[PDB]
Design a protein around this ligand. Structure first.
Ligand SMILES: CNS(=O)(=O)Cc1ccc(N/N=C2\C(=O)Nc3ccc4ncsc4c32)cc1
Length: 280
């Protein structure tokens, strides 16, 4: 805490405040996260600094002093949310959307292989740089240690042991948002969130989701809505994209496409790595 010079507040998070800081020694610019200390957390966090991948924000150091916990991460200048706002008028070029989705899936496939979930993906957690790369931030902090727009159905229905599938659902929601320039399910409460999903994808039943009527928060009194055509939901997206999106938004967590299989989807046959025009 004394070895860093806080430059600016980057924003309050779920587990703490994040600051852009300069290492008073090395002189390097980093992202300092003050966690708002259980031994289990220390161990779980420790395993994360060994998780290195080009599409994951690197956890540089863990400072545990005076019974306080600070996480030092690599620093990137902008998040996807800010980039989307800046591109609201023209929208993000399809090639860039494809590139970003492709890299995010590589990052998830890597984390999922090590059995590490995110559980709380959102545009604010996706960081981009001038090189055309995009990285996932906050990976694993949920295990070691409010927007509901990207929350998977199983979580909303009370399933306690969710899987890697919840991250695929969130990514599918972000995918749709980049394409249409509007959040797909902008709920303002848990029941509103659930109902917005049902009104679009249809109220789930035992046919599409075996075991759904046995979920802890499922109510037989839920209204029964019909499923809408994806052509209406994400209009400009081509057939390959709609096909991939539909598999990312399958109700049944077991039928939902995995990150690895998504990487082989036809939608990515012509993927490239364009460079975005960022205004820092
Ligand atoms: C509000 N968007 S903006 O682009 O205008 C300002 C801005 C500038 C940089 C960043 N980067 N933030 C982060 C960064 O560089 N590394 C991180 C590691 C963990 C984490 N947990 C939550 S954020 C966050 C970051 C995020 C916001």
């Amino acid at each position: 805490m004394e070895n860093f010079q806080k430059v600016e507040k980057i924003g309050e998070g779920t587990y703490g405040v994040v600051y852009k800081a300069r290492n008073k020694l090395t002189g390097e610019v980093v992202a300092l996260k003050k966690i708002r200390v259980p031994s289990t957390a220390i161990r779980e966090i420790s395993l994360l600094k060994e998780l290195n991948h080009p599409n994951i924000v690197k956890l540089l150091d863990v400072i545990h002093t005076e019974n306080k916990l600070y996480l030092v991460f690599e620093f990137l200048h902008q998040d996807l949310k800010k980039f989307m706002d800046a591109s609201a008028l023209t929208g993000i070029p399809l090639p860039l959307i494809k590139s970003y989705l492709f890299q995010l899936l590589q990052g998830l496939a890597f984390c999922h292989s090590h059995r590490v979930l995110h559980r709380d993906l959102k545009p604010q957690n996706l960081l981009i740089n001038t090189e055309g790369a995009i990285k996932l931030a906050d990976f694993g902090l949920a295990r070691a240690f409010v927007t509901l727009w990207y929350r998977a159905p199983e979580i909303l229905l009370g399933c306690k042991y969710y899987s890697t599938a919840v991250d695929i659902w969130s990514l599918g929601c972000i995918f749709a948002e980049m394409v249409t320039r509007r959040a797909l399910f902008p709920g303002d409460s848990e029941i509103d969130q659930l109902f917005r999903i049902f009104r679009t994808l249809g109220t789930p039943d035992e046919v599409v989701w075996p075991g759904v009527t046995s979920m802890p928060d499922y109510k037989p009194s839920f209204p029964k809505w019909a499923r809408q055509d994806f052509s209406k939901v994400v209009p400009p997206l081509d057939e390959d994209g709609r096909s991939l999106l539909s598999q990312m938004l399958h109700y049944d967590p077991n039928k939902r496409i995995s990150a690895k299989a998504a990487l082989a989807h036809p939608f990515f046959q012509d993927v490239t790595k364009p460079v975005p025009h960022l205004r820092l």
